[PDB]
Design an enzyme around this catalytic site. Structure first.
Site, mmCIF file in Angstrom:
data_model
loop_
_atom_site.group_PDB
_atom_site.id
_atom_site.type_symbol
_atom_site.label_atom_id
_atom_site.label_comp_id
_atom_site.label_asym_id
_atom_site.label_seq_id
_atom_site.Cartn_x
_atom_site.Cartn_y
_atom_site.Cartn_z
ATOM 1 N N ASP A 233 7.518 20.567 -8.996
ATOM 2 C CA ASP A 233 8.847 21.077 -8.690
ATOM 3 C C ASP A 233 9.541 20.176 -7.670
ATOM 4 O O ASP A 233 9.372 20.339 -6.463
ATOM 5 C CB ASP A 233 8.664 22.516 -8.172
ATOM 6 C CG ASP A 233 9.958 23.246 -7.933
ATOM 7 O OD1 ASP A 233 11.027 22.585 -7.906
ATOM 8 O OD2 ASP A 233 9.918 24.474 -7.737
ATOM 9 N N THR A 234 10.327 19.223 -8.137
ATOM 10 C CA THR A 234 10.960 18.280 -7.243
ATOM 11 C C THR A 234 12.023 18.924 -6.354
ATOM 12 O O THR A 234 12.390 18.339 -5.335
ATOM 13 C CB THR A 234 11.561 17.099 -8.001
ATOM 14 O OG1 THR A 234 12.492 17.606 -8.966
ATOM 15 C CG2 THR A 234 10.459 16.277 -8.694
ATOM 16 N N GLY A 235 12.524 20.098 -6.726
ATOM 17 C CA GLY A 235 13.439 20.870 -5.904
ATOM 18 C C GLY A 235 12.793 21.728 -4.827
ATOM 19 O O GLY A 235 13.507 22.421 -4.080
#
Ligand SMILES: CC[C@H](C)CN(C[C@@H](O)[C@H](Cc1ccccc1)NC(=O)OC[C@H](C)C(=O)OC)S(=O)(=O)c1ccc(OC)cc1
EC number: 3.4.23.16
Lengths: 99, 99
Positions: free
Chosen positions: B25-27
């Site tokens: 999850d890059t966010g």
């Protein structure tokens, strides 16, 4: 380009005639934008994340340019604290995770 | 590997000898896992997402093997909607966004 993850992967997007900063977010199924009064029809939706759910407006077939790469698709608008580019548009600009 | 985004980027992780599925999850700034037991002292922490704030337990310097790549870092545990690998560990495994 390649984007490392030392900091938040914020990039410039263009939507509905506005430039904005948004996260390239592989954890987001859908694209979620800060409150903005977009033209056209929409449908109510509720989406869930850390802390619970928020109410959003679902707009379809909205052109979004992400770092010079054209996309078009569904955008959810509501009281998110950050603009989020989700997988529905990330795939359209050819984005992958790599390690 | 190279991971495309037409599906959720779920991978198998190993933590405390147990296998779990988690979302790259890059966010997410931080890594947060659903309720589980981990050894050692933890610190109470609060984190906020799209739906508001939750209480989590912060465990530091925890080994996590993510799709065959080793990390040792901070793991939060609490009522996240799904197991999330955030940037704190994505950086350790050399994960980048590419398009
Ligand atoms: C369920 C998995 C995750 C939590 C889904 N979310 C994407 C995350 O990347 C989400 C993006 C975001 C960042 C900051 C504020 C608000 C949102 N990350 C997120 O909530 O991180 C919170 C903090 C920063 C953290 O690190 O916690 C561990 S989401 O809630 O923003 C989201 C949910 C549904 C969506 O489409 C259906 C799109 C986005």
């Amino acid at each position: 380009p390649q984007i490392t993850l030392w900091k938040r992967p914020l990039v410039t997007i263009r939507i509905g005639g506005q430039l904005k900063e948004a996260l390239l977010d592989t954890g987001a199924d859908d694209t979620v934008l800060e409150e903005m009064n977009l033209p056209g029809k929409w449908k109510p939706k509720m989406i869930g994340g850390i802390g619970g759910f928020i109410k959003v407006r679902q707009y379809d077939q909205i052109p979004i340019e992400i770092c010079g790469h054209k996309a078009i698709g569904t955008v959810l608008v509501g009281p998110t604290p950050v603009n989020i580019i989700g997988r529905n548009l990330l795939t359209q600009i050819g984005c992958t995770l790599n390690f």
